[PDB]
């Protein structure tokens, strides 16, 4: 014999997006390249790096990338011209 | 409800801009001032 069950109503989710840093500390970068595809201001932009409409960080001037602590807890990206 | 609308102008017939609007909040034929391309300057745009 058999018995019936159903109504899980949980098998759904968003086709998840990619979030991470795709330039390494010390990597050379070119103007307009992406540094960190955050979602929300997880790490604020420093000099020469902008802040996109979707909270993204991009380098304005080609050079070398560097991460560094901002204040007590926060971080910040920067690009140091070579 | 929000309904699509296309913008029009008296300075020149050729107009292209589109927008959204609520009938309840703006029953009246709305006006905006925007840059027309073919007139190459800013003008006052009505809707159709």
């Amino acid at each position: 014999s058999k018995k019936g069950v159903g109504s899980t109503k949980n098998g759904r989710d968003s086709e998840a997006k990619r979030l991470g840093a795709k330039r390494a500390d010390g990597q050379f970068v070119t103007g307009g390249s992406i540094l960190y595809r955050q979602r929300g201001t997880k790490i604020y932009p420093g000099e020469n790096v902008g802040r996109g409409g979707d909270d993204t960080l991009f380098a304005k001037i080609d050079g070398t990338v560097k991460f560094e602590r901002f204040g007590r807890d926060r971080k910040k990206v920067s690009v140091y011209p070579v | 409800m929000r309904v699509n609308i296309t913008l029009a102008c008296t300075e020149c017939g050729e107009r292209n801009y589109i927008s959204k609007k609520n009938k309840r909040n703006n029953p009246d034929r709305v006006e905006f001032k925007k840059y027309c391309p073919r007139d190459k300057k800013s003008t006052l745009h009505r809707e159709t």
């Binding site: 014999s1 058999k2 018995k3 069950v5 159903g6 109504s7 899980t8 949980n10 | -």
Partner: protein, 135 residues
């Protein structure tokens, strides 16, 4: 029969057990206590039976301390069903007990009677136990 009066979710992972207990490894409120030396689950029925076996025997001698709460629920699919197609309904509450945790503690009672009474209650639990006393 300790119900948690409310819970954030009624289903969650069974989890795993590793290492000694995080806290409450020794007697803290009573003269003497009982400790579990392996990891396992402990459920409402177990704590209730052990509590009664303690207090009903001990009568007016003193008070008994319980350091356990079955905040964790555990599920079980309905009887006679093909597995899968949704987690089963919850029907019991359980408390994780890693080794080293002291379960019950006694106060205001002579040593020997507490010893033998804890021995009596220990048979209610499914777990090898060791008698333990405050330093």
């Amino acid at each position: 029969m300790l119900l948690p009066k409310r819970v954030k979710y009624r289903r969650e992972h069974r989890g795993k057990m590793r290492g000694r207990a995080k806290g409450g490894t020794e007697v803290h409120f009573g003269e003497f206590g009982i400790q579990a030396l392996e990891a396992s689950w402990i459920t409402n029925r177990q704590i209730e039976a052990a509590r009664i076996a303690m207090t009903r025997y001990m009568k007016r001698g003193g008070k008994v301390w319980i350091k356990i709460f079955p905040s964790k629920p555990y599920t079980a699919k309905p009887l006679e069903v093909r597995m899968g197609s949704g987690k089963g309904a919850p029907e019991g509450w359980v408390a994780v007990v890693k080794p080293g945790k002291v379960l019950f503690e006694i106060s205001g009672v002579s040593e020997e009677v507490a010893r033998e009474a804890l021995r009596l209650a220990s048979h209610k639990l499914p777990i090898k136990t060791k008698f333990v006393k405050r330093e």
